[PDB]
Design an enzyme around this catalytic site. Structure first.
Site, short mmCIF file in Angstrom:
data_model
loop_
_atom_site.label_atom_id
_atom_site.label_comp_id
_atom_site.label_asym_id
_atom_site.label_seq_id
_atom_site.Cartn_x
_atom_site.Cartn_y
_atom_site.Cartn_z
N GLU A 146 22.51 86.40 89.62
CA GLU A 146 22.32 88.08 88.50
C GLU A 146 23.80 87.96 87.61
OE1 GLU A 146 22.84 86.66 91.47
OE2 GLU A 146 22.07 88.17 92.63
N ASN A 206 41.87 72.93 76.52
CA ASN A 206 41.05 72.75 77.49
C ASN A 206 41.50 73.03 79.00
OD1 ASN A 206 40.99 70.61 75.40
ND2 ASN A 206 41.67 69.02 76.55
N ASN A 213 37.36 77.55 68.21
CA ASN A 213 39.20 77.32 68.35
C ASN A 213 40.59 77.87 67.81
OD1 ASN A 213 37.44 75.95 66.29
ND2 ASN A 213 39.58 74.40 66.47
N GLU A 267 30.67 56.74 72.63
CA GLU A 267 31.44 55.86 72.76
C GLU A 267 32.27 55.77 73.62
OE1 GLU A 267 30.91 58.56 70.97
OE2 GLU A 267 30.25 58.47 68.75
N1 LIG Z 1 34.83 69.90 72.50
C1 LIG Z 1 36.40 69.25 72.23
N2 LIG Z 1 35.76 69.76 70.16
C2 LIG Z 1 36.55 69.30 69.62
C3 LIG Z 1 38.30 68.87 70.35
N3 LIG Z 1 38.79 68.04 69.48
C4 LIG Z 1 37.94 69.03 68.51
N4 LIG Z 1 36.79 69.18 68.52
C5 LIG Z 1 35.60 69.12 67.40
O1 LIG Z 1 34.47 68.59 67.95
C6 LIG Z 1 33.69 68.15 67.44
C7 LIG Z 1 33.13 66.96 68.25
O2 LIG Z 1 32.27 66.67 67.89
P1 LIG Z 1 31.16 65.25 67.55
O3 LIG Z 1 32.88 64.26 66.35
O4 LIG Z 1 30.03 65.16 66.59
O5 LIG Z 1 31.35 63.54 69.05
P2 LIG Z 1 30.76 63.07 69.45
O6 LIG Z 1 28.84 63.62 68.76
O7 LIG Z 1 30.86 62.33 70.51
O8 LIG Z 1 30.63 62.40 68.35
P3 LIG Z 1 31.13 61.86 67.18
O9 LIG Z 1 31.67 61.17 65.84
O10 LIG Z 1 32.12 60.01 67.31
O11 LIG Z 1 32.97 61.99 68.25
C8 LIG Z 1 34.92 67.32 66.19
O12 LIG Z 1 34.37 68.05 64.96
C9 LIG Z 1 36.06 68.88 66.28
O13 LIG Z 1 36.08 70.24 65.66
C10 LIG Z 1 37.66 68.75 71.83
O14 LIG Z 1 39.35 68.44 72.66
N5 LIG Z 1 36.72 69.16 72.38
#
Ligand SMILES: Nc1nc2c(ncn2[C@@H]2O[C@H](COP(=O)(O)OP(=O)(O)OP(=O)(O)O)[C@@H](O)[C@H]2O)c(=O)[nH]1
Ligand SMILES: Nc1nc2c(ncn2[C@@H]2O[C@H](COP(=O)(O)OP(=O)(O)OP(=O)(O)O)[C@@H](O)[C@H]2O)c(=O)[nH]1
Ligand SMILES: Nc1nc2c(ncn2[C@@H]2O[C@H](COP(=O)(O)OP(=O)(O)OP(=O)(O)O)[C@@H](O)[C@H]2O)c(=O)[nH]1
EC number: 3.6.5.-
Lengths: 50, 427, 46, 438, 438
Positions: free
Chosen positions: E254, E228, E206, E71
């Site tokens: 290791e 982060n 988290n 996206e």
């Molecule tokens: N890694 C990461 N995860 C987050 C963050 N904030 C919220 N999340 C959690 O990470 C998940 C994001 O995964 P997805 O929604 O599947 O992201 P995606 O696969 O790229 O596709 P989208 O639905 O369009 O965003 C969410 O369900 C949140 O609960 C963040 O800053 N970093």
């Protein structure tokens, strides 16, 4: 590396030309009046050239 | 150098020729008086293709005017540009027409064909080398049909080496006004297909539909209709007069559009037509140009080729375009309706792009169509001819002129041959 | 239209071009240059 | 000495020759007037221009090319251009009539009365030249004027001058894009006429040139100005051997001998590796390895052929810029280690390297990158036959239904010549096969 | 040499990877312009950055990471950020369509036409690399696009490259919080596909990250920026061994040898002991003892596991800063003397220590402490099987009532793969007590 700067070919050459100056100063002559003494010799005295 | 001399015929041609020429003068910016106002260098180069030189920067149009009724010329002469036309180029007759095609083809033409031949060769010798000629007239137009069939035949053996264009308008299918018109058209087309190679097909009813569609101005003038088709006619002539990487010669075009000799009949197509507020509601993009270019509503020539298939297509794009959009647009439409063309020939498109826009807009175009949509046209006239030839209606005149029913037999038979020919090639 | 110009102040116009040149009807002169030398020298109309 | 004569036939082929000469004056710094500044380079016509230009005692660099065209529209306009003073008036050979895409009209009707004129030009160019290694021919297959007129003149220049090289460069017909349906007619006619006379025919296709533009050059709306510059760079790279020296100096005669394996087929493929945008090259680095990977990457070829559907015979790389044998020979060695690239077992070695020290410069008002190390990749593979394989099944249908024949038989011809070329092509594919068969 | 490539798949994994590079440019002092001050560290790209950045003769640091997402909103936004000039345009691989949380949509519908591009990036990054120990994969189990796309690419990089390491890092699903009910569907799909190819997987949750924030960091309202920076600190600590040195130097090789007991289960847990707010660290003192107590204090773990309900297998500790083996060995000895610490009898020793003298640095505009002595505690215990035990009873219910299957079968799948994952999951639990049972 100046030897390696010496190993740096550039293929130079030179030549000349005369046409433009000829055309630039075509048909132009300077004119001056002078004299040479010949009285040093015991026969002639003087003569004038342009 | 290669140029064109125009032929103005028929009383319809009396109006289009005036409208067609004044657009060109306006496009090239010559004042009504005739003294050129130097503004465009490209037009400062290329009026010699169509005009010769008069004294004092005046540009004589190399066109010939022919008619019988003096009043039409006087209206033409009293027009905004009658001064830029020549009394030398005004040849006419001392007779009234009554649009008896035979009279203009056998009785009235005979004492006038000599003079028109003299004028054209005088003009032909005035210039050096032609591409050829074009003619504005009507196929169902009485005096125009009579004269042209003679003139086209005469110039055939005269100059069989030049570009021999014909511009005719089809009468209204719903009503022909003239009731002997189907006789006039059937007679003419018999010799036209023998003598012509290019033919533009135009119909007023479609032009009436266009006004209801995009002009949307309720009550137009027939000159406005002349404005539309003259612009289309000008567009095909822009390619010759203007620079830009697109190939101009109609022979460069004709061999690409003409697969077989009997194919002379062609359907024009024009580019953006804009309505009341859409001037400031339209984003001019080649996609929307291409969409509107290939619109059955934008069609104006005869009728919808939807009922048939497409033999050859050629569109000339006028303005600041590029090779890529025209290429991808052709692919898009190629994939859009792949089945609706004929499997005989794929890639039936012939594209030309004129870098020089017209005066007023930047991106424009023109299209010429050769599809299976003409069948209903002469199919229509087939029933009319057979119905009227069923009981020889209105026939004593032409016998009095010296015509016989035998001539009518081959004329329709020639037409019937075209019916099978167009049918057999596609169906 | 929206474009640029030509017919810059002579000397220009190598022989060979196709086109009408304004008031070219009085070429008692001989060369391509001399004609064009006078032709652009004569915008005097207005 | 080391000079050549260039030929530009076709109003299609004229703008590209202009751009090449426009490019050529930049690296020589030639001012549009026709003379360098007060610095001393003029003479009896001997300096870097001597191989390209003719800057005699008059001091005006005269390019050693011939522009020929039959429609005076474009040729007059460029005669109103910027360098027209450099260009010789009747060296800008023009015509008043077109060929209407018709090969034979451009081969019979009008070419007779003009070839004698251009024949006078070439001999008057021939006499002034000293070595004149060969000729550079820009043309096209689907030429409205390129096809027919070139074929006659190449016939005439071959018979009188058959002892020197003739270099052919034409835009290959687009496989699935056709601007004219008569294009197959003249194209196969040209091929069968040229195979027994053409020395080295090099082809390009505009579609992939466009495809390159929005892949790495990242221009969705380029123009010919870019298109001619890209091919203009290509001919510049191959001619850099004539302009400058290198670690080793290579010539078209070596190119001719080492590239074509066997007679008839003399149709290799060219590719320029460092085609990239300015900002991309700005924060990225170029080196022999990755550019060697790029030049052998199948999507980087300007011809729509899959090398994995063919096999490699000859491969010439022309490294221009600051390079060393060490990494180059090691990289190509690793290339020989690669399994996907399937050379024919007939040739153990198929790599012709031409090193040039001069870095490829940028052009003012251009779109190229700042290249220090560049290579021109010339190669020949069996994956080319699909193009003619595409050509014939287009032709066989159309010849069966004899479209547009009235146009050709009308102005003087018949079917035998059209028949004769199809087995020539049918020979070409079948000849392309047993050579592909090991 | 000692370098690696990082991978950040998904809008979830891109903002965190952004922060890591923001952190990484800080300790290296990298300016957002792309170059250092007048001081000299540039060259052929060989210094502390040679393992992370690619600062070639152009002088611009090119991070060795690839950001991939489906996206364009966030990636274009970061393409308009502060370091976007540093970031490579098409290394920031964007997308136009989403997977709609659907594992297979990102694995079948669109992943086909995009992986070919990223592989070109991988190989073109592979050639410029020298040792390339492995890859740093950052994702999310509940990946709307992270889950499905990663599964496709991870096997593709596994089949061609099965000789080097692959490091996995993702957010573990919240045991009692679910922002998506298809998340457990795709999560088990990822796990069963990754178990036979993933080398070393590491998880985090988290909620306890938030719980720490208002426990000792004393922030009841943090943001993602804190989240982060914490994980960015974690990956910084594990990568400090690559950057700096210390008493002994250790490597991921290791780590993988000394952590994973047997095949399949490769899921240890990370923890950072000195997680304390700033105002405290002024007026207390830090030493190895209390932080060792802290890192082994069960509530300080970011994963909701009770170690008393499990048994310890391995414990890897990375002391970053000024420490001595004396108090280290004495303190961990007291840990071995502890009775509540129930290690399995199978491991007489389970301690893996890596020492780095460089003190952990604070971040400008941050909220961490001023740490001289720090540890990132890596360990694996048997108290984790409950987490999968939570997923299966979550899973078995909805699968039995086959919710949302019309979505999944609608675009082309069947339940057999969903069948496989259940005994794939089941085999995991039964293994866990089998290795758990001595
Ligand atoms: N890694 C990461 N995860 C987050 C963050 N904030 C919220 N999340 C959690 O990470 C998940 C994001 O995964 P997805 O929604 O599947 O992201 P995606 O696969 O790229 O596709 P989208 O639905 O369009 O965003 C969410 O369900 C949140 O609960 C963040 O800053 N970093
Ligand atoms: N000038 C003109 N002609 C029109 C108009 N509308 C239809 N036409 C037709 O165009 C045809 C061609 O004109 P001409 O060939 O000069 O006609 P004609 O030979 O003088 O004899 P008729 O056709 O009987 O009028 C006419 O027959 C009209 O029927 C119009 O608005 N203006
Ligand atoms: N070489 C070249 N080809 C072009 C260029 N632009 C378009 N083309 C393609 O090249 C073809 C030109 O062939 P022809 O039309 O036969 O050209 P010609 O033989 O010189 O005669 P013309 O009909 O006047 O153009 C066109 O069909 C285009 O598809 C260009 O700038 N250079």
């Amino acid at each position: 590396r100046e030897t390696l700067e010496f190993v740096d070919p550039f293929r130079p050459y030179q030549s000349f030309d005369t046409l433009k100056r000829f055309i630039q100063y075509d048909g132009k002559v300077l004119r001056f009046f002078c004299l040479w003494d010949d009285s040093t010799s015991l026969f002639g005295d003087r003569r004038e050239f342009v | 150098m290669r140029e064109i001399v125009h032929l103005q015929a028929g009383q319809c041609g009396n109006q289009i020729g005036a409208k067609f020429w004044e657009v060109i003068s306006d496009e090239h910016g010559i004042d009504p008086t005739g003294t050129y106002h130097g503004d465009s260098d490209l037009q400062l180069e290329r009026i010699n293709v169509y005009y010769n030189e008069a004294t004092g920067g005046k540009y004589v149009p190399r066109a010939v005017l022919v008619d019988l009724e003096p009043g039409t010329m006087d209206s033409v002469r009293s027009g905004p540009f009658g001064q830029i036309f020549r009394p030398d180029n005004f040849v006419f007759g001392q007779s009234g027409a009554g649009n008896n095609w035979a009279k203009g083809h056998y009785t009235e033409g005979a004492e006038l064909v000599d003079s028109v031949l003299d004028v054209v060769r005088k003009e032909a010798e005035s210039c050096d080398c032609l591409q050829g000629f074009q003619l504005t007239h009507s196929l169902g137009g009485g005096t125009g049909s009579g004269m042209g069939t003679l003139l086209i035949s005469k110039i055939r053996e005269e100059y069989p080496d030049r570009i021999m264009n014909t511009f005719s308008v089809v009468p209204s299918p719903k009503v022909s006004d003239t009731v002997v018109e189907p006789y006039n058209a059937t007679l003419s087309v018999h010799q036209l297909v023998e003598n012509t190679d290019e033919t533009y097909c135009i119909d007023n009813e479609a032009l009436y539909d266009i006004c209801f569609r995009t002009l949307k101005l309720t009550t137009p003038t027939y000159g406005d209709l002349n404005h539309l088709v003259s612009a289309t006619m000008s567009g095909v002539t822009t390619c010759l007069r203007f620079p830009g990487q697109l190939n101009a010669d109609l022979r460069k075009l004709a061999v690409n559009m003409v697969p077989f000799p009997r194919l002379h009949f062609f359907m024009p197509g024009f580019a953006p037509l804009t309505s009341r507020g859409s001037q400031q509601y339209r984003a001019l993009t080649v996609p929307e140009l291409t969409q509107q270019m290939f619109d059955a509503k934008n069609m104006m020539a005869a009728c919808d080729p939807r009922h048939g298939r497409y033999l050859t297509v050629a569109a000339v794009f006028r303005g600041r375009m590029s090779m890529k959009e025209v290429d991808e647009q052709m692919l898009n439409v190629q994939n859009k309706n792949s089945s609706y063309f004929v499997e005989w020939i794929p890639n039936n498109v012939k594209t030309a792009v004129c870098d020089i826009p017209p005066r007023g807009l930047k991106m424009s175009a023109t299209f010429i169509g050769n599809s299976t949509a003409i069948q209903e046209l002469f199919k229509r006239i087939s029933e009319q001819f057979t119905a009227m030839f069923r009981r020889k209606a209105f026939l004593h005149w032409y016998t009095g002129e010296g015509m016989d029913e035998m001539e009518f037999t081959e004329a329709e038979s020639n037409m019937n041959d075209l019916v099978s020919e167009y049918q057999q090639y596609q169906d | 239209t929206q474009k640029h110009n030509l017919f810059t102040p002579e000397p220009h116009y190598i022989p060979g071009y196709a086109g009408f040149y304004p008031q070219l009807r009085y070429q008692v002169g001989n060369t391509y240059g001399r004609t064009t030398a006078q032709l652009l020298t004569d915008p005097s109309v207005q | 000495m080391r000079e050549c004569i260039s030929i530009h036939v076709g109003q299609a082929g004229v703008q590209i020759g202009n751009a090449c000469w426009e490019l050529y004056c930049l690296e020589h710094g030639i001012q549009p007037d026709g003379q360098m500044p007060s610095d001393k380079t003029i003479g009896g016509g001997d300096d870097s221009f001597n191989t390209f230009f003719s800057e005699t005692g008059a001091g005006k660099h005269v390019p050693r090319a011939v522009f020929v065209d039959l429609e005076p529209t474009v040729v007059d306009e460029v005669r109103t251009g910027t360098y027209r003073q450099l260009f010789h008036p009747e060296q800008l050979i023009t015509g008043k009539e077109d060929a209407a895409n018709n090969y034979a009209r451009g081969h019979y009707t009008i070419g007779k009365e003009i070839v004698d004129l251009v024949l006078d030009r070439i001999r008057k160019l021939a006499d002034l030249c000293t070595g004149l290694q060969g000729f550079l021919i820009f043309h096209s297959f689907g030429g409205g004027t390129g096809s027919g007129f070139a074929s006659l003149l190449m016939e005439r220049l071959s018979v009188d001058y058959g002892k020197k090289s003739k270099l052919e460069f034409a835009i290959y017909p687009a496989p699935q894009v056709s601007t004219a349906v008569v294009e197959p007619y003249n194209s196969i006619l040209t091929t069968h006429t040229t195979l027994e006379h053409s020395d080295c025919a090099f082809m390009v296709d505009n579609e992939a040139i466009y495809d390159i533009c929005r892949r790495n050059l990242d221009i969705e709306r380029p123009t010919y100005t870019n298109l001619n510059r890209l091919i203009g760079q290509i001919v510049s790279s191959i001619t850099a051997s004539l302009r400058f020296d290198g670690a080793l100096n290579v010539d078209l005669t070596e190119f001719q001998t080492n590239l074509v394996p066997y007679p008839r087929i003399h149709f290799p493929l060219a590719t320029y590796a460092p085609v990239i945008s300015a900002e991309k090259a700005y924060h990225e680095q170029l080196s022999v390895a990755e550019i060697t990977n790029a030049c052998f990457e199948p999507a980087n070829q300007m011809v729509k052929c899959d090398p994995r559907h063919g096999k490699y015979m000859a491969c010439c790389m022309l490294y221009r810029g600051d390079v060393v044998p060490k990494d180059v020979n090691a990289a190509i060695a690793t290339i020989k280690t690669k399994r996907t690239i399937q050379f024919v077992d007939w040739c153990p070695t198929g790599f012709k390297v031409g090193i040039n020290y001069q870095p490829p410069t940028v052009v003012p008002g251009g779109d190229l990158a700042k290249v220090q190390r560049a290579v021109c990749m010339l190669s020949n593979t069996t994956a080319i036959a699909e193009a003619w394989a595409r050509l014939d099944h287009k032709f066989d249908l159309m010849y069966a239904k004899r479209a547009f024949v009235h146009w050709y038989v009308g102005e003087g011809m018949e079917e035998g010549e059209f028949s004769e070329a199809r087995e020539d092509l049918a020979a070409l594919e079948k000849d392309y096969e047993e050579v592909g068969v090991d």
